[PDB]
Specification:
Residues 2-113 form the CoV Nsp1 globular domain. The chain has 113 residues and is mainly beta. 12% of the residues lie in helices and 40% in strands. The structure holds 5-(4-bromophenyl)-1H-tetrazole (A1CEI).
Length: 113
């Protein structure tokens, strides 16, 4: 399937133990996709002061369309040194590894793979 229904745990930035997916735009998109398949991916909502507390390159989920079965359609966009790789809608958050942090909420998404 081109799209997968996922419920992503929303993490507080100060709880996140692993603050990125790796060291290059291609690696972080690769690892983000692997973690999303393995159910080991979290979401941090972007507010003032969040991104400087995480590791570049960043992987965003961005709205790809205006929401089947309550799931917002999203795609991945990476960012390094102020350049984005991908073009998409509003950010829903920044993806990070999930290693057992307690979430504050769940975000239902339909992920384009
Ligand atoms: Br991104 C992403 C998310 C899930 C999957 C997947 N493959 N099989 N089941 N789920 C692949 C890529």
């Amino acid at each position: 399937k081109t799209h997968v229904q996922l419920s992503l745990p929303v993490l507080q930035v100060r709880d996140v133990l692993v603050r990125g997916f790796g060291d290059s735009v291609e690696e972080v998109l690769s690892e983000a996709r692997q973690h999303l398949k393995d159910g080991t991916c979290g979401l941090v909502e972007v507010e003032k002061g969040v991104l400087p507390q995480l590791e570049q390159p960043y992987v965003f989920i961005k709205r790809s369309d205006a929401a089947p079965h309550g799931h917002v359609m999203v795609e991945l966009v990476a960012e390094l040194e102020g350049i984005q790789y991908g073009r998409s809608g509003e950010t829903l958050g920044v993806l990070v590894p999930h290693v057992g942090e307690i979430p504050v909420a769940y975000r239902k998404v339909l992920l384009r793979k």
